[PDB]
Design a binder for this molecule. Sequence first.
Ligand SMILES: *[C@@H]1O[C@H](CO)[C@@H](O[C@@H]2O[C@H](CO)[C@@H](O[C@@H]3O[C@H](CO)[C@@H](O)[C@H](O)[C@@H]3O)[C@H](O)[C@H]2NC(C)=O)[C@H](O)[C@H]1NC(C)=O
Ligand SMILES: *[C@@H]1O[C@H](CO)[C@@H](O[C@@H]2O[C@H](CO)[C@@H](O[C@@H]3O[C@H](CO)[C@@H](O)[C@H](O)[C@@H]3O)[C@H](O)[C@H]2NC(C)=O)[C@H](O)[C@H]1NC(C)=O
Ligand SMILES: *[C@@H]1O[C@H](CO)[C@@H](O[C@@H]2O[C@H](CO)[C@@H](O[C@@H]3O[C@H](CO)[C@@H](O)[C@H](O)[C@@H]3O)[C@H](O)[C@H]2NC(C)=O)[C@H](O)[C@H]1NC(C)=O
Ligand SMILES: *[C@@H]1O[C@H](CO)[C@@H](O[C@@H]2O[C@H](CO)[C@@H](O[C@@H]3O[C@H](CO)[C@@H](O)[C@H](O)[C@@H]3O)[C@H](O)[C@H]2NC(C)=O)[C@H](O)[C@H]1NC(C)=O
Ligand SMILES: *[C@@H]1O[C@H](CO)[C@@H](O[C@@H]2O[C@H](CO)[C@@H](O)[C@H](O)[C@H]2NC(C)=O)[C@H](O)[C@H]1NC(C)=O
Ligand SMILES: *[C@@H]1O[C@H](CO)[C@@H](O[C@@H]2O[C@H](CO)[C@@H](O)[C@H](O)[C@H]2NC(C)=O)[C@H](O)[C@H]1NC(C)=O
Ligand SMILES: *[C@@H]1O[C@H](CO)[C@@H](O[C@@H]2O[C@H](CO)[C@@H](O)[C@H](O)[C@H]2NC(C)=O)[C@H](O)[C@H]1NC(C)=O
Ligand SMILES: *[C@@H]1O[C@H](CO)[C@@H](O[C@@H]2O[C@H](CO)[C@@H](O)[C@H](O)[C@H]2NC(C)=O)[C@H](O)[C@H]1NC(C)=O
Ligand SMILES: *[C@@H]1O[C@H](CO)[C@@H](O)[C@H](O)[C@H]1NC(C)=O
Ligand SMILES: *[C@@H]1O[C@H](CO)[C@@H](O)[C@H](O)[C@H]1NC(C)=O
Lengths: 661, 160
Amino acid sequence: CTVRYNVADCSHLKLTHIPDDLPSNITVLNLTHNQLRRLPPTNFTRYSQLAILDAGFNSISKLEPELCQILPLLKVLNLQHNELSQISDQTFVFCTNLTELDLMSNSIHKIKSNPFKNQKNLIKLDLSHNGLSSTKLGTGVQLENLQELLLAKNKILALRSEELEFLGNSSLRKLDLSSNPLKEFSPGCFQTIGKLFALLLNNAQLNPHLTEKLCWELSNTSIQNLSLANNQLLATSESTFSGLKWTNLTQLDLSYNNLHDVGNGSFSYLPSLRYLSLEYNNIQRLSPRSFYGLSNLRYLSLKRAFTKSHPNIDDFSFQWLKYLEYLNMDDNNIPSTKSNTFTGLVSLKYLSLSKTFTSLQTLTNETFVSLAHSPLLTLNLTKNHISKIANGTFSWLGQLRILDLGLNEIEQKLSGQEWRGLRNIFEIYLSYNKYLQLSTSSFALVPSLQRLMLRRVALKNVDISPSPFRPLRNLTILDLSNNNIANINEDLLEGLENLEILDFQHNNLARLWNPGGPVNFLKGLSHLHILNLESNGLDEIPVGVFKNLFELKSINLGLNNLNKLEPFIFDDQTSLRSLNLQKNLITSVEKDVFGPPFQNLNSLDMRFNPFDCTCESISWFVNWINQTHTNISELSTHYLCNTPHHYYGFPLKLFDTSSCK
Amino acid sequence: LDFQHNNLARLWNPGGPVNFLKGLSHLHILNLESNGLDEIPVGVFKNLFELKSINLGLNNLNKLEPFIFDDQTSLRSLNLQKNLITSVEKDVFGPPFQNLNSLDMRFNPFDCTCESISWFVNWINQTHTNISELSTHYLCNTPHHYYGFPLKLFDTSSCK
Ligand SMILES: *[C@@H]1O[C@H](CO)[C@@H](O[C@@H]2O[C@H](CO)[C@@H](O[C@@H]3O[C@H](CO)[C@@H](O)[C@H](O)[C@@H]3O)[C@H](O)[C@H]2NC(C)=O)[C@H](O)[C@H]1NC(C)=O
Ligand SMILES: *[C@@H]1O[C@H](CO)[C@@H](O[C@@H]2O[C@H](CO)[C@@H](O[C@@H]3O[C@H](CO)[C@@H](O)[C@H](O)[C@@H]3O)[C@H](O)[C@H]2NC(C)=O)[C@H](O)[C@H]1NC(C)=O
Ligand SMILES: *[C@@H]1O[C@H](CO)[C@@H](O[C@@H]2O[C@H](CO)[C@@H](O[C@@H]3O[C@H](CO)[C@@H](O)[C@H](O)[C@@H]3O)[C@H](O)[C@H]2NC(C)=O)[C@H](O)[C@H]1NC(C)=O
Ligand SMILES: *[C@@H]1O[C@H](CO)[C@@H](O[C@@H]2O[C@H](CO)[C@@H](O[C@@H]3O[C@H](CO)[C@@H](O)[C@H](O)[C@@H]3O)[C@H](O)[C@H]2NC(C)=O)[C@H](O)[C@H]1NC(C)=O
Ligand SMILES: *[C@@H]1O[C@H](CO)[C@@H](O[C@@H]2O[C@H](CO)[C@@H](O)[C@H](O)[C@H]2NC(C)=O)[C@H](O)[C@H]1NC(C)=O
Ligand SMILES: *[C@@H]1O[C@H](CO)[C@@H](O[C@@H]2O[C@H](CO)[C@@H](O)[C@H](O)[C@H]2NC(C)=O)[C@H](O)[C@H]1NC(C)=O
Ligand SMILES: *[C@@H]1O[C@H](CO)[C@@H](O[C@@H]2O[C@H](CO)[C@@H](O)[C@H](O)[C@H]2NC(C)=O)[C@H](O)[C@H]1NC(C)=O
Ligand SMILES: *[C@@H]1O[C@H](CO)[C@@H](O[C@@H]2O[C@H](CO)[C@@H](O)[C@H](O)[C@H]2NC(C)=O)[C@H](O)[C@H]1NC(C)=O
Ligand SMILES: *[C@@H]1O[C@H](CO)[C@@H](O)[C@H](O)[C@H]1NC(C)=O
Ligand SMILES: *[C@@H]1O[C@H](CO)[C@@H](O)[C@H](O)[C@H]1NC(C)=O
């Protein structure tokens, strides 16, 4: 087995017999994924100190009580994926300390007598996928402290007040009744339970009339979390949920219930709900009175809550949701917005509208007029086929912090008036766009940015003086990768004292680093953390470009052609934590180049390089590798030399340096 | 026969290499430039006696198996420029160099070592083959002492 500290785990050993050779100073034993004839009752004499046993995923036919007598200190008893054709009460008469019983696949058809007259400390009772037909588990009052009762993937036809009366004072935190073909509910079947809080009815095929009758039956109860998923709730009426008007609910779920129509006042009898979900529904439309009465909701999800003839939302449809703060409408097909769609939401702070608009190619200053009176903090608009934005689009939303406009085809000459009205925004998501032309005043109106990534935007004309990034001072993260920049001067990025993260992947900086004077990039970047110039076609590193980068942490210069390693290139990089030079054309590793970066390096990566197995090239590198604990992944595999012929295709570590000094 | 830019690299172990050019005696010029070939197996240029030109440039060829060119006794022009050739061995480029008229292997990471270029340097010193840009685009890439050094100006007195 693994034989780790204290606990013992045996993932896969093809074990067939209970072993007794392992040390006895253990408290947990694992038997998952093993083939056993039958659990012996007398072989546990040696192991009488196990707190719990993970004896599951086993082909055990019959269970004997004597086992859990030899181990009185037994807490978790998992018997899932086992045969267990039939069980009786005599297995649990002198077996009381159980706290966790798991029966997930045992094909237990009928329950006889009272098997649980002695278990007084059990909390979770998982009895599912066993073909159980009647929810009766006993006649007398038992299960004083039972918090979870799982009954799923069985064939219960109905619930009756007499088969559930055996729970006298049980306080069930979570009740599971999923995948049960329930067709009717006897009156008073829920009042016999002491205190029930949550219920699950997934894959239970609830009819709307059956759902209404269930809601009537659920009155007087302390239910707070109710879930109704995978049903035939194609429509909802005013009186459908009226039976829940006497309950104090917290969460209501209606996902995967193909709801087509929402009646007027459907949830008007729910003055205490705080979280609501309508995921994956073919809702035709939402009337303004559909949400009437929901004055206490705080989280609404409308993911895939619309039909393909296209669905639309009327104005003033969210006025009643004055306490909502998290609205999600991802993956929908609303054509466009109106003047009074979001009007009424006075507490919305997190709004997601990803892939929800189809006819909103052009954005004006009337699209987000409804959100002026709402202090939003996050706005998601990805995959919305955004093509053009007008001035004053975000003027109303002056409290925005997180803005998303990526994964679109925006094409426009940015002038800085597109962000007019934004007071204090944290970061802007404009990656993955077809064409965004920058100007000298594009970022002047918003100097409060903290993160700014422009991946795959085909940006151009960024060498214009003054740089558009000049007004940004406290910016921390900047990304201009995958854009194929033609050229850049030292004017850009100047004054970014607070900049920490910089990425220049796929930007062809080859010629920018001797003719016309080398560009002295990275001037005074004290706060820069990680520098990434991977796959920029770099061919030669000019001297004096990594200076003053004392606080730099990581360097990634892979997928390039670097062979001319100038001496003393890395002098101030004494705080480097990870050096990446994989897939380059490095031939020799000299001490004067990689010395200071190797003083306190944590991980190194320069694989796929034509190394030269010679005393002049890798002797210092081989000595350092042999005399360091730096994490070098695939050191023995992808570090083969390319020259000479004798040492071609040989591991870098398998080189003797005792003959050269 | 011209196969420029066709991605024939992996065709020369997918169930055994394909023995292409099987008994193609009358072919005169063969051009397979810029196909990314990485390894040429033995017994692929057999029965090519009348072939005159081979052009395998703009590829990545470093594994030169012995006796690759055995029937290329009538080769007139060999082109291997802009490849990843590191060493030039006699047993590989012997027969093609018997009557070669023009040779082109510029822009290659040559290794200025005794085992690699000694025979090639001697051949260059004692041949009349017309080679363009021989002293400019034939600089070695390793070691550091011989990096960026002309290939023709190599002393073989310390070799053999
Ligand atoms: C359990 O749920 C039932 C509903 O199924 C609740 O019944 C409701 O009980 C209240 C209080 O007894 C009734 O209000 C009363 O109405 C009479 C007129 O009939 C009025 O004179 C009283 O002043 C009082 O307002 C209410 O009508 C009744 N509703 C129904 C539909 O029966 C019951 O309160 C819940 N709790 C318990 C512990 O049963
Ligand atoms: C706005 O909604 C869209 C809906 O798709 C969100 O897109 C999803 O965002 C997550 C988190 O960024 C992405 O997961 C990521 O996957 C990549 C690998 O592709 C992984 O490297 C990251 O660590 C992360 O796990 C997810 O792929 C992405 N889905 C699509 C289709 O783009 C978007 O994040 C939302 N905007 C927010 C929350 O600001
Ligand atoms: C969204 O932004 C646009 C762009 O500024 C605003 O359009 C502006 O609307 C005002 C009032 O309609 C225009 O003022 C008047 O325009 C007429 C010509 O239409 C002119 O003859 C008058 O002397 C007066 O200037 C203004 O010109 C117009 N701007 C542009 C560039 O056409 C629009 O009002 C904004 N919408 C919201 C809701 O903020
Ligand atoms: C959205 O905002 C941009 C940025 O301000 C507006 O572009 C600006 O439009 C004005 C008005 O046409 C331009 O002023 C013009 O300048 C020329 C000289 O170049 C002058 O001869 C004209 O009489 C006029 O004053 C301004 O140059 C231009 N700026 C840029 C950077 O393009 C745009 O018009 C706004 N659009 C809407 C719909 O409000
Ligand atoms: C219903 O389920 C929700 C979701 O788990 C429970 O709310 C969580 O309560 C814990 C405990 O305070 C918090 O840490 C979580 O942040 C809450 N999550 C959400 C989404 O609200 C709620 O307590 C449950 N109702 C019960 C058990 O009656
Ligand atoms: C939620 O719980 C509250 C508190 O128990 C219920 O309010 C009580 O309602 C009864 C009538 O059934 C009154 O006699 C009590 O005086 C009320 N107490 C308080 C503190 O208001 C409420 O009815 C429950 N249900 C809903 C939907 O709120
Ligand atoms: C549900 O209630 C809404 C009101 O919230 C009703 O919508 C109104 O319909 C009338 C008739 O055309 C219009 O004059 C009103 O302007 C509408 N209200 C709003 C806010 O626009 C709707 O008709 C009701 N539906 C049912 C089936 O009763
Ligand atoms: C740029 O970021 C800095 C760092 O947070 C901001 O400085 C802080 O701003 C908050 C906002 O009120 C103040 O409470 C702090 O006292 C400021 N810290 C210091 C050291 O001055 C700065 O305001 C930001 N500038 C812009 C334009 O957003
Ligand atoms: C358990 O005890 C029986 C009886 O001695 C023995 O045959 C068997 O090998 C022991 N171990 C297991 C894993 O059954
Ligand atoms: C349940 O609670 C009632 C009332 O407090 C009490 O009379 C009864 O003994 C309790 N039963 C159990 C099994 O705790």
